Amino acid sequence: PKGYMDLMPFINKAGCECLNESDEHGFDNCLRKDTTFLESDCDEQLLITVAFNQPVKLYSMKFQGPDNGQGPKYVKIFINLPRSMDFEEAERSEPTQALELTEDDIKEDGIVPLRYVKFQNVNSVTIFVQSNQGEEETTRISYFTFIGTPV
Amino acid sequence: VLESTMVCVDNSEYMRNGDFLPTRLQAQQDAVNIVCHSKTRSNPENNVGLITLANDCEVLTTLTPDTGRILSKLHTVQPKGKITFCTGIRVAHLALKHRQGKNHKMRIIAFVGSPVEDNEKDLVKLAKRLKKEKVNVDIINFGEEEVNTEKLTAFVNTLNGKDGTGSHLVTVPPGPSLADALISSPILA
Amino acid sequence: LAVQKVVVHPLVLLSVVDHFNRIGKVGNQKRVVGVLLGSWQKKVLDVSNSFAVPFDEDDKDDSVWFLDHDYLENMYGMFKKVNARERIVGWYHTGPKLHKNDIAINELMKRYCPNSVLVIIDVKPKDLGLPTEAYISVEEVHDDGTPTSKTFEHVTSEI
Amino acid sequence: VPGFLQQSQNSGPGQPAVWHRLEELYTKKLWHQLTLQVLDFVQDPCFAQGDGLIKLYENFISEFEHRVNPLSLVEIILHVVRQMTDPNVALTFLEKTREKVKSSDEAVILCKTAIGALKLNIGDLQVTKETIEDVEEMLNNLPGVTSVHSRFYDLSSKYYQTIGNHASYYKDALRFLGCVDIKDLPVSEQQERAFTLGLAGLLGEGVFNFGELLMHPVLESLRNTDRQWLIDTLYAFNSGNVERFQTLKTAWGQQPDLAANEAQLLRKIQLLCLMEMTFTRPANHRQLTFEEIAKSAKITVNEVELLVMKALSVGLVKGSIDEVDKRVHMTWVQPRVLDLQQIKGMKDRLEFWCTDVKSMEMLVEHQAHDILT
C-alpha cells in the first residue's frame, strides 16, 4: 500500500483454478468482495491457484474468512509450479510460506504479512488451505487478494 | 500401471454363509489370491497391502512388493463382528497417503459382503474426499447386493464424476465363485 | 506396577523434536508417533533411543488411525543389529495431552512389548514441567459396578 | 433329512410362511443370516410352551451346526433347553453342547453359566461354586465386556443370594447393572433389582459407601414405589442418622431379611454415625467426647469405646481414643460422595490455598532476587 497496490487487475482470472470448489459458492466471490464468500464441498481442505503476468511482486495477502470457524487456519503458499498440482503435491511438498493464521488475521480488518524476499518474480501462486479454525467440514473465505507491485 | 493397492477384505459374520462355494471367507481368499497376483505382474514395483473390515478396522499388512505375506495373513482371518465400511476406506486411504513411493497411484480394493449401515449422505461425502486425492476404490458388490446396489451406486458415480472410469462397481450374482467373474471384470483388465 | 520410573535420555528428546519438525515441515500435524527403544534395569525404565514410524489419524474420528507396524518391525531389526541391548519399551507421541485413541495404539504397541510405556514428549518448551509424561496401560477395576476398562496410569518420568 | 422343514412347510407348528423364509435361506445357504431368522423364531410368541421346538434341535440346527457362530449357537440352545424340563439330562445336553463350542471362549462362558443356573435350581451349591470359580476366572481373560458377562453376573448374584453372603451379592449385583442398559430392562425387573441391591448393601459386610449406591439409576425406579422406605433407609445410613433408622422401623421391620439382622444393621449405622460426626466437624475440632458419640449413636457411654474399635479396626476412621479424658481423637475419615455445593466449598478452599502458595512464591522471589538463578 505504501507505494504498492492491490493486484486483481494483473490476475488474469482465466488461469485461476480453485480445486475443491463448491457449486453453491464459487471462486468469484472472494476476489470481488461485495459480501458473499467462497466455500469448499468435498472436504475442509481447499486448494487455490492464481495466475497472472510473470512480473508481479507480493508483499501481503488478506485471506479474511468468516468468524464461525470456517475461515482458514493453516494455509500453504507455493510459487511457480510447473505442471498441475494435486492435493498431495500441495500437502507433501515444501511451501515457500506456511503461515498459520490466527483469528486476528481472519478479521476483515486484518492483513497478514508474507516473506517478501521469497516473493519477487512470481508466475503463478498456489494456495493450499489445509485446515480451518475448527472442525467445519467446509472451509469458507470471505475475501482475498495480493497487495504488492509489478516487477 | 505403477499403482499401490490395498485390499479391504471383509470378515464379518456374513462371511460364514455358503452362498459362494465353499465359504464367503474362503471364496474371497481365492479372490485376493488372484487380484493381488494380477497387480504383481502388471508392474513388479506395485504395492499390495491388507486391511481387515471387521467391527474395528485392522491393518494386517501394509503396502509391500510381496504376495505370499498377504495370503498368510488372510489364512488367520476368522469371521467376527459387523462390517464398518465408513471407517474401512478412510483407514485404507490413510495408509495410501503413507506409501513406499509417492509416484504410485491411489487404488483401494474393497470386498463388500455385508450391508453398509450408513446414510447416503455420509457415503457420498466419502466419495468426494477420495476424488479430491485422486483415490479410486474398486468394490465388488457380492453378498447382499440386493440392498447395497443403491448405496454403492452413489459411491462410484460420485467418485468417477462424469468422465473417466477411475473406479468400478462390478457386482457378481451368487454362483460358483466370485473370483471366476473377477478375471472378466475391468478390475483385473 | 510393572514400572517404577521411566528415564528418558536427551537423545530421545532431540530425536522426537527433530521427528516432529521434519514431518511437521511438509504438512501440519497434530502429533507425530514413534517407537521408544531402551533397556530394563530392576523396575526403572531406561528409554534411550527412538525411531519414527509412519502415522496418521483423522481428527473427526478417533477410530480411524494408521500406524505402519511393518515399518515398525523393519526399523527394529535395524536398531537391534546395531544395538542388541536396546529393545522396544513403548512408544511416544508429541501431542500436548493424551488422546482418546492412545489406548488403542498402545494395544498395537503392546504386542511387541507387553509392558508398553507411552511417553508423551511435548515439543513445545513448557516453562515449569518436564517435557515427558510416562503412562502405562492398566486395568482399572471400578467399585461402582461399571465394567473394567483400559486406562493409562501415570509413571514418574526423569531425564 | 430336511423333510421336517418340508413337513412344517404345509402342516407346521408355526406359521407356514415363516418356514418358507426359513427354507429359502437354507437353499441360498445364507448360513449366518438364518440364525437371526432362527433367533426370531426360537423365541416364538405362539409355541414357546409347546414341545415342537425340542425336535428343532436334532432335525434342523444340528445339521448346519458345523458352520454357525459358536457364540450365536449357544444362546439358541438356551431357549431350546428351556422347553426341556428333565433336570439331569439337561446336563448331558449342555455338556455335549459345551464340547462343540470350543473355539469361542465366550460360548463356553455362556455354556457354563447355563449349567450353573439350573444346577443352582437343583440346590447343588457346592459344585455351582466350583463352576462359578472357573467361569469367573475365564471371564477376566476375555477382553472388555461382552453379551456373556451379564448372564454370569445374574447367576453369580443368584448364587450368593441363596447362600446368604450379602457382601458378595452387593458387589456382583452392581456388575450386572453395569453391563446392561436400564432402559432395556422391564420396570418390574428394575424395581425388583433395586430392592435386593439396596437390601444387600445394608446387610453386606463392609458395604459402607452408600453415597455411590444412592445415585445408582437403578434406585430411581423406587422414587414413587411403595418401596420408597428403602431409599429413605439408605438415606439414614448415608447420613448416619440412627434416630431416623429407629423411626423407619415400622417400614423396614416388615421385610423378613431386614428385621432378622436388626442387630447387625444397628451396628452398621452406628459406625456410619461415627463417620458423620468426624466428617461434619472441622479438622481443628475433631476431638469427639464420649457423650457426643453416645448421644448421636443412641448407645451407652461404656459402649462408645467398643464402637470406635470397630471403626478403627475395619478402617472407616483413623484416630485414637483417650479413655481418661473420655475423648476420641479422629484424624481421618473415609472419603464420601459430595454434592455440588460441597464441591464448590472445596474449590473455594483451593482459592485460599492457591493465594497462599502464590504469596510466598513472590515473597521468596522478591527477597532472593539477587541470588536467584
Curated annotation (Swiss-Prot), chain A:
Domain of life: Eukaryota
GO MF entry, a single one: protein-disulfide reductase activity
Compartment(s): Cytoplasm; Nucleus
Tissue and organ distribution: Ubiquitous.
Domain PITH: 1-151
GO cellular component, one term: nucleus
Alphabetically ordered keywords of this record: Cytoplasm, Disulfide bond, Electron transport, Nucleus, Phosphoprotein, Proteasome, Redox-active center, Transport
Complexes and interactors: Component of the 19S regulatory cap of the 26S proteasome. Interacts with PSMD14/RPN11. Interacts with, and reduces EEF1A1.
Role summary: Active thioredoxin with a redox potential of about -250 mV.
Protein's UniProt name: Thioredoxin-like protein 1
Protein's gene: TXNL1
UniProtKB/Swiss-Prot annotation, chain B:
GO MF annotations in UniProt: identical protein binding; molecular adaptor activity; polyubiquitin modification-dependent protein binding; RNA binding
Position of the Glycyl lysine isopeptide (Lys-Gly) (interchain with G-Cter in SUMO2) cross-link: K121
Domain of life: Eukaryota
GO CC, alphabetical: cytosol; nucleoplasm; nucleus; proteasome accessory complex; proteasome complex; proteasome regulatory particle, base subcomplex
A GO biological process held by the record: proteasome-mediated ubiquitin-dependent protein catabolic process
UniProt keyword annotations, A-Z: Isopeptide bond, Phosphoprotein, Proteasome, Repeat, Ubl conjugation
Domain called VWFA: residue spans: 4-187
Family, as annotated: Belongs to the proteasome subunit S5A family.
Free-text domain note: The 2 UIM motifs are involved in the binding to a multi-ubiquitin chain in a cooperative way.
Subunit-level organization: Component of the 19S proteasome regulatory particle complex. The 26S proteasome consists of a 20S core particle (CP) and two 19S regulatory subunits (RP). The regulatory particle is made of a lid composed of 9 subunits, a base containing 6 ATPases and few additional components including PSMD4. Interacts with NUB1. Interacts with SQSTM1. Interacts with UBQLN4. Interacts with UBE3A. Interacts with UBQLN1 (via ubiquitin-like domain). Interacts with DDI2.
Name listed for the protein in its UniProt record: 26S proteasome non-ATPase regulatory subunit 4
Organism: Homo sapiens (Human)
Residues of the full protein shown: 2 to 190 of 377
From Swiss-Prot, chain C:
Gene: PSMD7
The keyword Lipid biosynthesis appears for this protein: no
Subunit structure: Component of the 19S proteasome regulatory particle complex. The 26S proteasome consists of a 20S core particle (CP) and two 19S regulatory subunits (RP). The regulatory particle is made of a lid composed of 9 subunits including PSMD7, a base containing 6 ATPases and few additional components. Within the complex, PSMD7 interacts with subunit PSMD4 through their respective MPN domain. Interacts with TRIM5.
GO cellular component: cytosol; extracellular exosome; extracellular region; ficolin-1-rich granule lumen; membrane; nucleoplasm; nucleus; proteasome complex
Domain (MPN) ranges: 6-141
Range within the parent protein: 4 to 162 of 324
Keyword Cell cycle: no
Task performed by this protein: Component of the 26S proteasome, a multiprotein complex involved in the ATP-dependent degradation of ubiquitinated proteins. This complex plays a key role in the maintenance of protein homeostasis by removing misfolded or damaged proteins, which could impair cellular functions, and by removing proteins whose functions are no longer required. Therefore, the proteasome participates in numerous cellular processes, including cell cycle progression, apoptosis, or DNA damage repair.
Transmembrane intervals: none
Protein species of origin: Homo sapiens
Keywords assigned: Acetylation, Isopeptide bond, Proteasome, Ubl conjugation
Any one GO MF annotation of this record: protein homodimerization activity
Protein name: 26S proteasome non-ATPase regulatory subunit 7
Miscellaneous comment text of the record: Does not bind a metal ion.
Curated annotation (Swiss-Prot), chain D:
Cytoplasm found in the keyword field: no
Subunit architecture: Component of the 19S proteasome regulatory particle complex. The 26S proteasome consists of a 20S core particle (CP) and two 19S regulatory subunits (RP). The regulatory particle is made of a lid composed of 9 subunits including PSMD13, a base containing 6 ATPases and few additional components.
A Pfam family that the UniProt record links to this protein: PSD13_N
Domain (PCI): residue spans on this chain: 168-335
Record's protein name: 26S proteasome non-ATPase regulatory subunit 13
Keyword Acetylation attributed: yes
GO process terms (BP): meiosis I; proteasome-mediated ubiquitin-dependent protein catabolic process; ubiquitin-dependent protein catabolic process
Membrane-traversing stretches: none
Entry-annotated residues carrying N6-acetyllysine: K295
Its biological purpose: Component of the 26S proteasome, a multiprotein complex involved in the ATP-dependent degradation of ubiquitinated proteins. This complex plays a key role in the maintenance of protein homeostasis by removing misfolded or damaged proteins, which could impair cellular functions, and by removing proteins whose functions are no longer required. Therefore, the proteasome participates in numerous cellular processes, including cell cycle progression, apoptosis, or DNA damage repair.
UniProt GO cellular component terms: cytosol; extracellular region; ficolin-1-rich granule lumen; membrane; nucleoplasm; nucleus; proteasome accessory complex; proteasome complex
Keyword vocabulary terms for this entry: Acetylation, Proteasome
Molecular function GO labels: structural molecule activity
Source organism of the structure: Homo sapiens
Family: Belongs to the proteasome subunit S11 family.
